[PDB]
RNA sequence: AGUAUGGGAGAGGAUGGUAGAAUUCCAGGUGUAGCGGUGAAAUGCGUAGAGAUCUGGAGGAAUACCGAUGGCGAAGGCAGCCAUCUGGCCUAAUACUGACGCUGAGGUACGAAAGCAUGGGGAGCAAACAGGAUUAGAUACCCUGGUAGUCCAUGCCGUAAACGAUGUCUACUAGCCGUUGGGGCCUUUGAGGCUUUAGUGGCGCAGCUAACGCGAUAAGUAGACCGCCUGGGGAGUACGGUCGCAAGACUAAAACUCAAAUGAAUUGACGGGGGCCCGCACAAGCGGUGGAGCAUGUGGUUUAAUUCGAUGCAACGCGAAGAAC
């Protein structure tokens, strides 16, 4: 602003898992107010990862998020925690968009599973940030 | 081929460049690198990052001759003196002593005219 | 002649040397040597410095 | 006002030696692809080897720190250290001469920098000039080079915002705070505190001034002598003369033309002056336009007519909330 400090806007927990992380991911996926489509996409992927490995959807998602989380931007300085997660979700949706499959939910589940082993364009971009950070 | 344990580093840091020269004692050159030799053409030659890059290359080159402890002399009011001296420790030498040897005239020759920019 | 003792780090050595050079003030002479200063300008600058010094002394006295 | 005797401070002057730092060049080792420079570049230097680093040599010019609102000198000016020759100033007490004083038209001496003459010297810097940039153009500012000159000896020139924009000499008129060179007193042991004198600074009463300001270093109160001014231009110009090798300097008008030209301060406005502050101004984000097809308005062109108005932001889906008659 210039004079004031504006508080962050608190988002409600997801009504199905009570997960603010899942709610934020849904908000990142959603376009032009179509919340139902984003909910379907996210829930389908959460069920798919559960079948393809029997793991808890919430814990598996947090672990993959922490794996794809950067640590630094760029002038080196320490990125604040919220921006880390905000940047990780953007990479995870962008890279998932470019796979070839029938539905967005299946692509999201597939690349979540792929990133759980460190294989994916998001992790590659993370290594790129690591390299250019070593540059500075 | 020649092996020497104790060496001297010279950081000539001007406002347009920085030259890092590694020699033994009695001033016989062993390895050197400048910001111009790693790209960084034009005005970017004076950045501290280029000085660090040149210092790393020079230290790694001298590691072949096999120095472990060295004495550092910095001359010139360059922006890359601190980066050049820091990069040597990162490379892995032991800086026994580091000093400033910039020359000062005792009211000698006349310097050039002032720029009316 | 910053001679390091047994176990200071490189950064500590750098900062201590920077403090020593700041105390020595060699860079001021190097900057002064870049261009020629005419005696008129030198006298004007020294007169201004003396005036500022005397103004500072009265302020510190009060 | 001056003289003799003791002591003191100082980049005062002239001559001759000598020391260290640094720049340039040269010779030689180590060593290998850049160096240099700018807002960004380029001209330029370099593989017949630079730049960097080490050793030695040559030469010229200037004296870091001390360094100071310090010091000395009539002014111009004077800074490493040492010797020789030499001028002035401050300070104490007696002694001595007895108005020997102040100013000064003509005259005469000194007089920054640039410039001139004869002979030397030449590191760095650098008018003129050459090239590279920038620009609509660049003749300039910026960059790479570079000759006079800057230095020495012997002479000339005689001008500067040569300024404190304040002629020299004398006496008197509240105070407060610094600093330089001396004298005296007091403590009391060694560092301080009071006075007095000659300089050098900052405030300020009275007084003065158009105001700004000055104010014992007067622009106050008075006295002595000298120089100079009489609206702005033409004009420190022409003619004549004197001086100078020259460049030029000094003395110095008129015709003609205008009703102004100036000083200080006040209110605004502006500044590619400075501080502080705000705004989707930027920063962080999410969507667009600029590309395609179509709708609509404008410019242009065309036409018998393509009715008229709106033109940077603040005109262009605007007047028109609706042209087949």
UniProtKB/Swiss-Prot annotation, chain A:
SUPFAM superfamilies: Ribosomal protein S7. CDD domains: uS7_Bacteria. GO terms for molecular function: rRNA binding; structural constituent of ribosome; tRNA binding. GO terms for biological process: translation. InterPro entries: Ribosomal_uS7, Ribosomal_uS7_bac/org-type, Ribosomal_uS7_CS, Ribosomal_uS7_dom, Ribosomal_uS7_dom_sf. Gene3D superfamilies: Ribosomal protein S7 domain. It holds the Pfam family Ribosomal_S7. Signal peptide: none annotated. Keywords: Ribonucleoprotein, Ribosomal protein, RNA-binding, rRNA-binding, tRNA-binding. It comes from the Bacteria. GO terms for cellular component: small ribosomal subunit. Belongs to the universal ribosomal protein uS7 family. One of the primary rRNA binding proteins, it binds directly to 16S rRNA where it nucleates assembly of the head domain of the 30S subunit. Is located at the subunit interface close to the decoding center, probably blocks exit of the E-site tRNA. Part of the 30S ribosomal subunit. Contacts proteins S9 and S11. This is Small ribosomal subunit protein uS7. It comes from Acinetobacter baumannii (strain AB0057). The gene is rpsG.
């Amino acid at each position: 602003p210039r004079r004031r400090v504006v508080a962050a806007r608190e988002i409600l927990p997801d009504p199905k898992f009570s997960s603010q992380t899942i709610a934020k991911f849904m908000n990142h996926v959603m376009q032009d107010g179509k919340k139902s489509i984003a909910e379907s996409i996210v829930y389908g992927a959460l069920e798919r990862v559960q079948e393809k490995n029997k793991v808890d959807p919430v814990e598996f998602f947090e672990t993959t998020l922490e794996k794809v989380r950067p640590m630094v931007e760029v002038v080196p300085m320490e990125v604040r925690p919220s921006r880390r997660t905000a940047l990780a979700m953007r990479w995870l949706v962008d890279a998932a968009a470019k796979r070839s499959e029938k539905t967005m939910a299946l692509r999201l589940a597939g690349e979540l599973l792929d990133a759980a082993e460190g294989k994916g364009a998001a992790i590659k971009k993370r290594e790129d940030v690591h390299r250019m950070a070593e540059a500075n | 081929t020649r092996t020497v344990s104790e060496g001297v580093a010279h950081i000539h840091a001007s406002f347009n460049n920085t030259i890092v020269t590694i020699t033994d004692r009695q001033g016989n050159a062993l390895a050197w690198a400048t910001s111009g030799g790693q790209g960084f053409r034009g005005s970017r030659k004076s950045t501290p990052f280029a000085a660090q890059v040149a210092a790393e290359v020079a230290g790694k080159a001298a590691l072949d001759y096999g120095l472990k402890n060295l004495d550092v002399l910095v001359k010139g009011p360059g922006p890359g003196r601190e980066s050049a001296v820091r990069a040597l420790g990162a490379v892995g030498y032991k800086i026994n002593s580091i000093t400033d040897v910039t020359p000062i005239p005792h009211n000698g020759c006349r310097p050039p005219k002032k720029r009316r920019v | 002649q910053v001679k390091l003792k047994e176990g200071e780090p490189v950064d500590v050595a750098i900062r201590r040397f920077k403090r020593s050079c700041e105390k020595a003030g060699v860079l001021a002479d190097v900057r002064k040597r870049e261009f020629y200063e005419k005696p008129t300008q030198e006298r004007k600058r020294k007169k201004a410095a003396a005036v500022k010094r005397y103004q500072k002394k009265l302020a510190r006295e009060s």
